[PDB]
């Protein structure tokens, strides 16, 4: 705690342009003032010749529906003059220079006796509103005809906040006294005057309108464009009050940008409808009250950051919607009842106000556990993530901060084709409720889908995409028959994150059934209808429910509101997300009965395995040695759930078929005293143990692999028990004489040895030691990290079609894979696989190697890394980080609870591969928010490779392994001799192997090892690209070691023997081989 | 270009062919060798040899050899190659470098002979061959490729045999 105030004063260094982008703007809103103070006044009149004062004029009228017609609005008009002064961020100077450009503030209040008393009844005060600003402007364009500023300026009718029934004016400027640099637009927006009536028609329940529903829009809509003065008044009582308040407004209203909540409004679509002002009013609120004792939470005698906190901590933690609020008078306490309204509430005595009815209960009840959130990431004193909670945009993209999302595809034709294309009711309580058809609609969806869902899902946000907050003059309002409609959108985006528990429970139980039924049960079977049931389970328990069909490529997320769409607001309607599907059958469908049926967090294939290692765990227990089991027990991917071909019984050509599973001993004082005598008595209890197997439980098959992957020990040989069940283990012992005999082989290794003796050292310890409790963690957090299985699964797809998985290691594409789950700060965990893989894919590219390690805990939400050892992994990735620049050979720093070490899985790597993870990562996140999630898109994020590689060799099996492999578009049995499994398998990633073994020094290979999770419907086709190092530049002249093929043509000078090298890759695999490609 | 013959110090080049494959439009591979002697026991009367092909076990080096003795006569008494670390699995010594006894580059082999002769008949022999294939590298003598690769090394997926891994224990541990 105490880089904190200098992060503060470094933000607001950076956020600070405070005179040579203001004052002249200062000097046009002089000339603009003065100009609208030399505008006359103009006397009583009527709208029925009014209309045709507009009637060929070049000005328009804005209004809202319905027109005015001059029957029941008799109705007269006065222009007189008000006094102007500045309002909000620019007057409170707070200004923020975006790329996209703030706004600025204006007045213009209204005088008392040019207008009656009688402002509540069918908006004709916003009608005189509207004509007021509307002959206003027109002489604003005539003194623009006549002050020749006509060719850079532009004038433009608006939607004020995003309100259709607030109009405004605002000036933009278009390609001395021309002016492009600074945020741009300014606006003219109204004010009425303070005192205009008696005390009890300002409660947003009442009614006064025609055919007793509220009016909560209109008669907060009408207060606010009234009061634009009084929170100023307060604000800067307020401001005169603490010194904090400028750093508080700053700090908080870039948290409010950077989380996308503006000030607009939430009703029609959008998501925002909270804002800087509403904050701070909130603040100065919550500053002079908070409490029922009335506890001042607040203190103004100090810093903005501790401000902070309390507001945040407030606006977290006491809920304002569903159970009461506390409200604050100001001319000033602050108080709680406990009356819910169904909306964000805090109210008023001085201004009589609802100031959050702008609004929604969804848009609150997402930024509440946005306020949690954050509380959450600055109470913790260990880390520092002052990027995560002030620096990065998380609304930028439209699929990290989201789950799922739909189309939602309106083609209903036009405002008379509503009544028999929206399936909704369309009336006079509804519109007068509600006060246009988009707002009214998108509050009906959002009920239909939080009915529809309830707890399969956290949060709920629509938005009316293409939605457009202005109009030119040339027309009264937007009229724009785009995507099927004459409404203000073409089609709508809704938006879930889900809880994960509950993503695909097939059932969604209503009430339990009495004999009277009840009336939720009755609104369950209304919903519903035809798949609506009455219910009995095991447990003899009546209920209303309806079933659905879990699938591999739709999840019933899907199915569900496609129903909840086509029944209960339109028919016609289409509702789809093809890129849900698209990834979904990316990921490998394995070959078990009825395994298009099943879900994609079903892991029973990894429990059936494990079923059949309990069975092979009994039968090894209950046998003798004569130095008896220590403990046995699984290490391998499938076990901790991760293998991406998940395993379907007898399939030999999977890699991870054979799962590595480790047994020790006690711990006799009879071992070896010399690693090869070591590893030959580890075998010959392997070999006790598979006589005794195949003597007793003749049904499981046994053989021996000699092991190859601990470098310079050639004795480790590795049995492997073939179940009846369909699975394979390779078995291998660890002993306690092990770890000390290869420490002292680094001790009295040669001295330019030592760094080769540890390499291999590392290699022991990510395989047998640390792998254990890698696996422990792992199935330990998979169960609170549902989604993590298969966004891991498909992200080593992702990393086999680009070929990097020979090099990158599969536990530190796990570690890299749960880094947004332990750690999903500051955005949400995933509850979709698109958006696990996709925040793994944005922060691999986000993340920079040599200024920052990868720390994370391996924890459940609500063991944990403390101050110490967070401290100890930043001194010793600041140790690597010295004794090594820029990265040379250690280029991923991972490290964990399981891991403080950190060198650990991310040895023996090479830089091109390292760069080209982080290139191609980045590469994914420019093309993703260049095009956005399409199919063609997801299809060329999942296409391999066509990049700056230089060999292609092109390679096929002589029969295609997905039928033998388990990947379907059958194998049951094992052979009579165990040596087919040889011709069965693949070669290729081996046969690399040693190619890469051999070459190391002169350039690096690659191979795609699943051959058919991506080469192919028959699954045969594998690459195998080289990439020359970028030693091997020029031509060298012959050293003793340097390590390359050569083909000397002069004296001097040798090349690379590139034909007769690449022949005798050719050659070495000239079955398999059918191809080569030069670039 | 190929009529340099000679390089910097004691160099010579031995080049050969490569057989047929199916996606390739003349495939040659070089081998370097110089020559040392010691007072040691086999890293005297040796050749260098530098750029050898995957695996080159004995018998097809002995085919070169036995090609050679078949064609011009030589004195030749070589039956087993040294020092041929050919992937990488040999650069240290685990077992002694942790043992009490077993005890006492990149890319090379060690080919002995044990006569003078034999080593001057295949210098100047491969030095008249790295000539003639300079100027002319049309027909040589060239590699006879009955597979060594397919069957002395394809044993990654072929499980070890029982009473072969049963008696190198017992006689390791013995």
Not at chain 1, 527 to 538: A, D, N, T, V
């Amino acid at each position: 705690s105490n880089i904190f105030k200098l992060q503060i004063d470094e933000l607001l260094e950076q956020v600070k342009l405070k005179q040579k982008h203001v004052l002249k703007v200062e000097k046009f809103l002089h000339k603009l003032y003065d100009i609208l103070q030399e505008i006359p006044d103009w006397e009583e009149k009527s709208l029925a010749e009014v209309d045709s004062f507009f009637k060929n004029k070049i000005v328009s009228v804005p209004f809202v529906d319905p027109k005015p017609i001059p029957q029941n609005t008799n109705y007269k008009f006065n222009y007189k003059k008000p006094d102007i002064s500045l309002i909000g961020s620019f007057a409170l100077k707070a200004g923020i220079y975006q790329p996209n450009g703030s706004s600025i503030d204006t007045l213009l209040t209204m005088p008392k006796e040019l207008f009656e008393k009688k402002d509540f009844l069918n908006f004709r005060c916003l009608h005189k509103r509207s004509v007021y600003l509307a002959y206003l402007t027109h002489h604003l364009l005539i003194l623009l005809k006549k002050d020749k500023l006509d060719s850079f300026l532009q004038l433009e009718y608006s939607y004020f906040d995003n309100d259709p029934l607030l109009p405004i004016l605002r000036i933009s400027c278009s390609k001395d006294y021309n002016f492009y640099k600074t945020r741009f637009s300014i606006n003219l927006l109204i004010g009425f005057p303070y005192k205009v009536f008696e005390p009890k028609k300002l409660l947003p329940n009442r009614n006064c309108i025609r055919i007793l529903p509220a009016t909560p829009l209109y008669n907060f809509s009408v207060l606010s464009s009234s009061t634009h003065e009084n929170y100023l008044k307060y604000l800067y009582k307020t401001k005169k009050q603490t010194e904090s308040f400028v750093e508080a407004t700053v700090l908080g209203r870039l948290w409010l940008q950077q989380r996308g909540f503006s000030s607009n409004m939430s009703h029609s679509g959008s998501l925002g409808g909270f804002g800087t002002f509403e904050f701070t009013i909130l603040m100065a609120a919550l500053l002079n009250g908070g409490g029922i004792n009335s506890n001042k939470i607040l203190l103004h005698g100090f810093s903005s950051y501790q401000l902070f906190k309390g507001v945040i901590k407030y606006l977290a933690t006491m809920d304002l919607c569903h159970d009461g609020h506390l409200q604050f008078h100001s001319n000033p306490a602050s108080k709680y009842i406990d009356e819910g309204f169904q909306t964000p509430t805090l109210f008023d005595k001085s201004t009589k106000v609802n100031i959050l009815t702008k609004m929604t209960v969804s848009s609150y009840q997402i930024l509440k556990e946005y306020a949690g959130e954050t509380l959450r990431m600055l109470n913790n004193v260990v880390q520092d993530q002052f990027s995560n909670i002030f620096l990065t945009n998380i609304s930028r993209f439209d699929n990290l901060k989201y789950d799922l999302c739909y189309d939602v595809q309106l083609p209903l034709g036009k405002y008379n084709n509503l009544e028999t294309s929206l399936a909704a009711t369309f009336g006079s309580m509804e519109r007068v409720k509600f006060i246009t058809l988009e707002n009214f609609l998108a509050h009906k969806i959002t009920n239909v889908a939080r009915y529809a869902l309830g707890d399969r899902i956290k949060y709920i946000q629509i938005e009316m995409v293409g939605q457009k907050s202005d109009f030119p003059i040339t027309k009264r309002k937007v009229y724009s028959n785009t995507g099927g409609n004459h409404f203000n959108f073409d089609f709508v985006r809704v938006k879930l994150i889900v809880n994960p528990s509950e993503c695909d429970k097939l059932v969604t139980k209503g009430p339990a059934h009495s004999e009277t039924m009840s009336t939720e049960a009755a609104v369950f079977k209304n919903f519903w209808g035809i798949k609506s049931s009455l219910r009995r389970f095991k447990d003899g328990s009546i209920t209303h429910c309806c079933v659905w069909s879990t699938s591999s490529s739709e999840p019933i997320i899907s199915s569900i509101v496609n129903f909840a769409l086509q029944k209960h607001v339109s028919k016609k309607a289409q509702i789809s997300n093809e890129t849900i599907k698209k990834f979904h059958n990316f990921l490998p469908l394995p070959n078990l009965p009825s395994s298009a049926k099943t879900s994609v967090l079903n892991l029973s294939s990894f429990f059936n395995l494990k079923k059949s290692f309990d069975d092979l765990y009994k039968i090894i227990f209950q046998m003798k040695l004569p130095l008896s089991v220590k403990s046995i027990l699984p290490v391998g991917s499938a076990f901790r759930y991760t293998s991406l071909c998940q395993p379907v019984p007898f399939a030999y050509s999977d890699p991870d078929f054979f799962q590595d599973v480790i047994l020790e001993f006690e711990t006799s004082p009879k071992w070896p005293d010399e690693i090869t005598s070591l590893e030959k008595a580890k075998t010959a209890f392997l070999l006790k143990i598979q006589e005794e197997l195949s003597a007793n439980s003749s049904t499981y098959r046994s053989f021996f692999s000699r092991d190859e992957s601990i470098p310079y020990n050639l004795e480790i040989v590795t049995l492997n028990i073939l179940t009846p069940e369909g699975y394979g283990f390779k078995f291998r012992v660890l002993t306690e004489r092990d770890e000390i005999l290869y420490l002292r082989a680094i001790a009295n290794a040669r001295n330019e040895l030592k760094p080769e003796l540890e390499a291999t050292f590392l290699k022991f310890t990510a395989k047998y030691l640390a792998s254990v409790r890698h696996t422990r963690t792992l199935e330990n957090i998979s169960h609170s990290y549902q989604f993590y299985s298969p966004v891991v699964r498909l992200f080593k797809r992702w990393l086999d079609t680009h070929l990097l998985l020979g090099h990158i290691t599969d536990e530190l594409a796990e570690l890299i894979a749960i880094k947004p789950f332990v750690d999903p700060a500051p955005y949400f965990i995933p509850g979709s696989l698109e958006n696990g893989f996709l925040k793994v894919l944005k922060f691999i590219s986000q993340w920079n190697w040599k200024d920052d390690p990868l720390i994370l805990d391996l924890v459940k939400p609500e063991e944990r890394l403390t101050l110490a050892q967070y401290k100890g992994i930043q001194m010793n990735f600041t140790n690597l980080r010295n004794s090594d620049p820029n990265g040379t050979h250690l280029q991923f720093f991972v490290a964990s609870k399981n891991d403080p070490s950190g060198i650990l899985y991310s040895s023996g790597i090479p830089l091109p591969i390292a760069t080209r993870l982080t290139a191609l990562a980045k590469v994914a996140v420019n093309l993703l928010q260049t095009h956005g999630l399409n199919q063609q898109t997801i299809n060329l994020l999942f296409t391999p490779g066509l990049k700056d590689y230089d060999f292609v060799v092109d390679l096929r099996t002589p029969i295609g392994l997905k039928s033998s492999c388990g990947i379907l578009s059958a194998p049951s049995n094992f052979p009579e001799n165990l040596n087919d499994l040889s011709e069965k398998m693949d070669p290729t990633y081996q046969l690399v192997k040693y190619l890469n073994l051999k070459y190391k020094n002169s350039l690096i290979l690659s191979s795609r090892k699943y051959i058919g999770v991506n080469g192919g419907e028959k699954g045969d086709k594998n690459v195998i690209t080289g990439l020359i190092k970028p030693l091997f530049k020029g031509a060298h002249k012959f050293r003793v070691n340097l390590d390359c093929n050569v083909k000397p043509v002069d004296d001097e000078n040798v090349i690379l023997n590139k034909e007769a090298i690449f022949h005798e890759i050719a050659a070495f695999g000239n079955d398999m081989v059918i191809n080569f490609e030069t670039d | 270009i190929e009529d340099i013959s000679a390089m910097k110090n004691g160099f010579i080049v031995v080049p050969f062919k490569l057989p047929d494959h199916k996606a390739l439009p003349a495939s040659l591979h070089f081998m370097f060798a110089k020559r040392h002697q010691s007072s040691n026991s086999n890293e005297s009367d040796c050749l260098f040899l530098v750029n050898l092909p995957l695996l080159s076990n004995i018998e097809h080096m002995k085919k070169f050899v036995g090609q050679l003795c078949g064609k011009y006569d030589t004195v030749s008494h070589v039956e087993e190659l040294l020092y041929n670390d050919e992937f990488g699995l040999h650069e240290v010594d685990l077992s002694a470098l942790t043992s009490d006894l077993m005890s006492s580059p990149r890319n090379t082999a060690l080919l002995k002979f044990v006569d003078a002769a034999s080593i001057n008949n295949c210098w100047n022999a491969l030095k008249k061959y790295s000539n003639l294939h300079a100027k002319h590298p049309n027909e040589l003598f060239e590699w006879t490729y009955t597979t060594p690769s397919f069957t002395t090394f394809v044993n990654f997926y072929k499980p070890l045999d029982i009473d072969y891994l049963k008696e190198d224990i017992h006689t390791h541990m013995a």
